[PDB]
Structures are given as structure tokens and as C-alpha cells.
Amino acid sequence: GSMRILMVGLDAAGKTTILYKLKLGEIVTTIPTIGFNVETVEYKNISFTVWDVGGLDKIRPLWRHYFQNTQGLIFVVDSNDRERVNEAREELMRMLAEDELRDAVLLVFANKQDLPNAMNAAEITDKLGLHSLRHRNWYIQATCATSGDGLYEGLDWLSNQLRNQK
């Protein structure tokens, strides 16, 4: 068995970029993902099956098909997209309301930190209302997917949540 991780977030957030940076160590050219991409990533001797599911609004209903048995959620946010940060919050809270996910741990990637007007992790925390969450293991990590910055730190937390020993 591997650890089942669902990676979701609005379209353009950087999910597919993150998946292939994590898996392949390269920055891949993408198009908006119509279905899903999937790879198993090994980190510190723990294997994570990461489901990168398309975030275009039209296909957001399909996220629910991936909730079952999910152990960890990676919610990717475009930290430069102030106009849509409340929409990101709404989608996150709609997902967190699901009983199926009540035990899932939540890693938020505050992505695109390379952009000069990016909101930082503290700001994104406020905008997503993370501090109000109850009975939820959660962590927010500032990242730049293209440079790799912050990714392994996110994985450190996620691996620690899901593993029970060295």
C-alpha cells in the first residue's frame, strides 16, 4: 500500500507543475488538466500516490469521485491571484465539509511565491480561514513550484503526519 493523496485547487494554481516537479525533478509544459494525472512519489522511504485532479470550474464536481479513502489533501493556491482567493477558500471549505475526508490531513501549498505581488503564507492563512479549523491536522507551506522552493518542506510535514515510525 501507498499513502493516498488528493491534490486539488483552482485551475492554474500549479498542481500539475508540482506533480511532475516532485516526480521527475523537471518543470513540464502543461495544459489545463481535463481529467487527472497520477504518480507515486517516494519521500524519506514513504510512498505517496498523488492524484492531481483538474481544477477548471466545470469539472470541480468530479473531485468528489476521489475523496474515498484519501489520507491527505494537498490544496494548491495561486498566491498571486487575489481575485480568486475567496473562491479557493469556498472550494476548500466545501471539500472539508465532507464526512469522507474528516480524518484527512491538509497540506496547503501557497504557490507562486516568486511573483512579486504574491500573498505570503501568513496572508493566505487568513484568506483561507485556516486558523478557525477544528480537529484538523493542517500545515501551510510557501512554495515556488518552478524553482522547487518549499516543496520538500511540505513533504516533510505530510510524511510525518502519515508515517508512524522511521
Ligand X SMILES: Nc1nc2c(ncn2[C@@H]2O[C@H](COP(=O)(O)OP(=O)(O)OP(=O)(O)O)[C@@H](O)[C@H]2O)c(=O)[nH]1
| Nearest Cα residue to 127 out of 11, 49, 10, 26 | 10
What residues from 116 to 135 belong to the interface with ligand X (CB under 6 A)? none
Q: Is 16 in the site for Mg ion (CB under 5 A)?
A: yes
Out of 92, 144, 151, 155, name the contact with ligand X by CB under 6 A. Answer: 144
Nearest approach in angstroms of CB 57 to Mg ion is: 14
30 is an interface residue for ligand X by CB under 6 A: yes
**Closer CB to ligand X, residue 111 or residue 141?**
111
Closest distance between Mg ion and the C-beta of residue 8, in Å?
A: 10
x/- mask, ligand X, residues 40-69, rule CB under 6 A, reads --------------xxx-------------
The number of angstroms, rounded, from the C-alpha of 112 to the middle of its chain's C-alpha atoms is: 13
Q: Of 88, 133, 85, 78, whose CA–CA distance to 109 is shortest?
A: 78
Q: According to the annotation, is 80 in a ligand binding site?
A: no
Question: Which residues lie closer than 8 Å to 139 by C-beta, 6 or more apart?
Answer: 106, 107, 108, 154, 157, 158
9 is known to lie in a ligand binding site: yes
Smaller CB separation from Mg ion, 87 or 103: 87
- Pairing, β 72-78 against β 3-8: parallel
Residue 23 labeled ligand binder: no
| Residues contributing to the annotated binding site for GTP | 9-17, 111-114, 145
